[PDB]
From Swiss-Prot, chains A, D:
Belongs to the herpesviridae small capsomere-interacting protein family. It comes from Epstein-Barr virus (strain B95-8). It is found in: Virion; Host nucleus. The chain holds residues 1 to 77 of 176 of the full protein. Interacts with the major capsid protein/MCP. Participates in the assembly of the infectious particles by decorating the outer surface of the capsid shell and thus forming a layer between the capsid and the tegument. Complexes composed of the major capsid protein and small capsomere-interacting protein/SCP assemble together in the host cytoplasm and are translocated to the nucleus, where they accumulate and participate in capsid assembly. It comes from the Viruses. This is Small capsomere-interacting protein.
UniProtKB/Swiss-Prot annotation, chains C, G:
This is Major capsid protein. The lineage of its organism: Viruses, Duplodnaviria, Heunggongvirae, Peploviricota, Herviviricetes. Signal peptide: none annotated. The chain holds residues 495 to 543 of 1381 of the full protein. It comes from the Viruses. Homomultimer. Makes the hexons and eleven out of twelve pentons. Interacts with triplex proteins 1/TRX1 and 2/TRX2; adjacent capsomers are linked together in groups of three by triplexes, heterotrimeric complexes composed of one molecule of TRX1 and two molecules of TRX2. Interacts with scaffold protein; this interaction allows efficient MCP transport to the host nucleus. Interacts with capsid vertex component 2/CVC2. Interacts with the small capsomere-interacting protein/SCP. Belongs to the herpesviridae major capsid protein family.
Swiss-Prot record, chain F:
Homomultimer. Makes the hexons and eleven out of twelve pentons. Interacts with triplex proteins 1/TRX1 and 2/TRX2; adjacent capsomers are linked together in groups of three by triplexes, heterotrimeric complexes composed of one molecule of TRX1 and two molecules of TRX2. Interacts with scaffold protein; this interaction allows efficient MCP transport to the host nucleus. Interacts with capsid vertex component 2/CVC2. Interacts with the small capsomere-interacting protein/SCP. It is found in: Virion; Host nucleus. The chain holds residues 593 to 691 of 1381 of the full protein. Self-assembles to form an icosahedral capsid with a T=16 symmetry, about 200 nm in diameter, and consisting of 150 hexons and 12 pentons (total of 162 capsomers). Hexons form the edges and faces of the capsid and are each composed of six MCP molecules. In contrast, one penton is found at each of the 12 vertices. Eleven of the pentons are MCP pentamers, while the last vertex is occupied by the portal complex. It comes from Epstein-Barr virus (strain B95-8). Coiled coil: none annotated. This is Major capsid protein. The lineage of its organism: Viruses, Duplodnaviria, Heunggongvirae, Peploviricota, Herviviricetes. It comes from the Viruses.
């Protein structure tokens, strides 16, 4: 925390953007409350990063599992 | 324990580029136009990628060997897809060999130090920072005024220059291109309403501290290029406003009608630019030439010459004369050195360029006789001057004795073989013949 | 005095005749034995150190 | 002692004839108070160089901004 | 994760990334390499954040020497010591164009006699580089000076 | 009485990869996400396939020489028609050298 | 005392002006003949065992 590498160049406004994510209402749980502006904005951006990473791992888990014998058996007719 | 990264076939490739009587002069003008800035070269990356690609596929040779900064730019970025994969390897081997000679000289330099400073300064002229490379696009002069202990007097015309504090009153810095957006018109109006004759002011971009100090540029200009060309190169002066009048007054540049991406040679009106493009055999798109037109704001007005004069080290300083305690040298400002031109090329190219003789490697009778009719009639009426050692260059520019690179250096380089052992010999001649350098020699 | 290098090159190379040659231009062009032959006393006079 | 170099051969009076562009009204400002006509055409040519280079640099700056997020969210749907 | 094309549920997995990637570190980092991975590949890399460990560290293992070499007046002389880099990787020299991109995410640690190299560590830090420029005799790997 | 399994050409290849100036830095991010875990390499194999393939195509040099774990995983898990044979033989002969 | 390595790197490499070189780093530089030569008697004094 003493010395950190400077923040990587990123486009902003991924929260208030046009595309709508199902994660977004749970993201509404966080509030500034105590924090100043820029600290809370980058903290909530990090939290959204954590949410999207959780979503990616969950979808990968559901993707890897495979295809059942019964569905291919129904796929005759 | 140096092992040569570079290979002999790539040196023969460089030699074939050196004796090219079909060298494309348009690429040479582009080389003159970027003049060694990162941002100016990212302005023009896809043009020069097309340039290297077409010149590499059309004949088995590559351009842009000349200027070191364009070499470091091509080695640093872009690369990868745009140019052909084999043509990248020549540049990589050149840059790697330039790196490897530096650790060779550092190992020949001692580990032990006199005081605070290192002793490689005394051992090798190349490692010695009092020496200066010929082409200067970054502000080396103020940096050398800081680092050099012994009095490095700089002559600009009539006027001396020895104090760092004089840096505003004698040097005009070139601002960064995005920053100068307010001051474009003030840059341009100086051309019409200011006299560049007896200006005594030097327009230079910012210096960059990035890496390798100064050793690499010195070994590239003073070792690799004089060997690989048999030292057939001359200094170049550029008339930039005529180059801008070529590129910018073009028909597609005005054109709202003509689109962004088309072949300019389809719809040029007849001029020197069309003839340059056809002799250079390369069809460019319109946005490329518009980028080259856009670059004219920040590029300098004209070429200049500068005398650098530095006192000797304390080993060799002993002399009865004060004037013989100090060794003198030249640096070309905003100009570039030069392979031989074709005879057909100098019909429209003469409106852009002129010849400069320089120190012994870069002062050549055949190339300067190519560039001017006067030098040609001189060398014709007196053929004995055809050799590099005899050829007489102006007192205004040149003096043989008060220099770092004398005549037998150039005589060695003229009959030099393209072998890499000759690269090692050219390197080995740069030892300063200093008493402590004799200790360094007695070690190995 | 003047900055322009065009006239610097031109006025030196405009009208030339028989052109001077320096000393070390001839000190670098001879082989060893022809140099050490006692018919070039000029060059042996001026290579003492 | 000012003999730099002669002009490279180009089309006479191209901008008066061929285009109708935003460069034309800014070109209307240029005047000939003192100078001879040939020198006026020379300085006119350099001024047209200056204007075209201004315009091309501005178009490059417009290209440098790249692609925003919300516009892609709108159209790619 | 914060890219946008990896964010949007609307965007398709198999599609190439650079048709919708915005100005940022991913554009520069891929533009250096000219590498086009599909978006779901970047998604699977984003899945790594669960058991992704924290910052790299240095841990010094100090052991006694061999029993044949045990003899000494000093017991502290008997130990020989080695610093292992935890959660970190070893790397070659960076380009200077890639330095401004990689600086946000990575920092040099010269910690081993073979891995403490001046031309490689000089690229990663401006401090090491300026120190090298001030006295160039540091370029030897045998004489190169590392933190205590 | 050992016989070496690596010839001088593949050592030249690895040396070239060492002296690469344009080594793709994105690989390090991949390595940073891998950090020597088996399961995550099995997760991310269709990316390291494309990385090895494209860097082997762009220059004769190969990738991922940095950490032993990555080379171990490439020697183990690939075994397929998809990755080019000439790149795979390099890693196979290197691991055979260590054996 | 503190765990972060970036501070350890930057604080060592930020403002250092000098470079000390050890004994064996100078011994590995020299060839044999100069090492046995009595110009270097500081380094040769400590090669007993």
């Amino acid at each position: 925390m003493a010395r950190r590498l400077p923040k990587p160049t990123l486009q902003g406004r991924l929260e208030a953007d046009f595309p709508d994510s199902p994660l977004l209402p749970k993201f509404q749980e966080l509030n500034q409350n105590n924090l100043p502006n820029d600290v809370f904005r980058e903290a909530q951006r990090s939290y959204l990063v954590f949410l999207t990473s959780q979503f990616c791992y969950e979808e990968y888990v559901q993707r890897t599992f495979g295809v059942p014998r019964r569905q291919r058996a129904i796929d005759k007719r | 324990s140096l092992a040569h990264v570079v290979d002999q076939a790539v040196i023969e490739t460089v030699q074939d580029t050196a004796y090219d009587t079909a060298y494309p002069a348009f690429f040479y003008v582009v080389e003159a136009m970027i003049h060694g800035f990162e941002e100016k070269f990212v302005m023009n990356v896809p043009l020069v990628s097309l340039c290297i690609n077409t010149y590499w596929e059309r004949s088995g040779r590559l351009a842009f060997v000349n200027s070191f900064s364009m070499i470091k730019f091509i080695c640093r970025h872009l690369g990868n897809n745009a140019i052909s994969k084999e043509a990248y390897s020549m540049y990589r081997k050149i840059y790697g060999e330039l790196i490897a000679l530096e650790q060779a000289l550092m190992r020949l330099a001692g580990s032990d130090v006199v005081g605070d400073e290192s002793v490689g300064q005394y051992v090798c002229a190349l490692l010695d920072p009092n020496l200066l490379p010929p082409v200067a696009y970054t502000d080396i002069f103020t940096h050398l005024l800081t680092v050099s202990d012994r009095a490095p007097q700089i002559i600009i015309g009539n006027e001396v220059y020895a104090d760092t504090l004089a840096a505003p009153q004698f040097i005009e810095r070139v601002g960064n291109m995005d920053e100068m957006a307010a001051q474009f018109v003030a840059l341009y109006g100086y051309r019409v309403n200011g006299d560049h004759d007896h200006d005594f002011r030097l327009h230079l971009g910012p210096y960059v501290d990035e890496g390798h100090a100064d050793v690499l540029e010195k070994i590239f200009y003073y070792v690799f290029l004089p060997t690989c060309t048999n030292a057939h190169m001359c200094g170049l002066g550029v008339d930039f406003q005529h180059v801008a009048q070529t590129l910018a007054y073009n028909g597609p540049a005005f054109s709202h009608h003509f689109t962004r991406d088309e072949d300019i040679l389809d719809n040029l009106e007849n001029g020197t630019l069309r003839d340059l493009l056809e002799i250079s055999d390369l069809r460019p798109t319109v946005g490329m030439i518009r980028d080259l037109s856009a670059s004219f704001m920040t590029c300098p007005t004209f070429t200049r010459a500068v005398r650098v004069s530095v006192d000797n080290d304390v080993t060799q300083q002993l002399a009865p004369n004060p004037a013989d305690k100090r060794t003198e040298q030249t640096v070309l400002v905003n100009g570039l050195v030069a392979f031989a031109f074709s005879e057909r090329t100098r019909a429209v190219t003469q409106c852009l360029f002129h010849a400069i003789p320089f120190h012994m490697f870069y002062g050549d009778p055949r190339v300067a006789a190519t560039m001017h009719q006067d030098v040609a009639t001189f060398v014709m009426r007196n053929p004995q001057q055809r050799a590099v050692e005899a050829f007489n260059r102006p007192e205004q520019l040149f003096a043989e004795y008060r220099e770092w690179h004398r005549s037998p250096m150039g005589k060695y380089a003229a009959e030099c073989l393209p072998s890499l052992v000759s690269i090692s010999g050219m390197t080995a001649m740069h030892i300063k013949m200093s008493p402590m350098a004799y200790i360094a020699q007695a070690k190995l | 005095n003047h900055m322009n290098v065009l006239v610097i090159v031109d006025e030196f190379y405009d009208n030339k005749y028989a052109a001077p040659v320096t000393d070390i231009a001839l000190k670098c062009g001879l082989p060893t034995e022809d140099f050490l032959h006692p018919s070039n006393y000029d060059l042996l006079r001026l290579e003492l150190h």
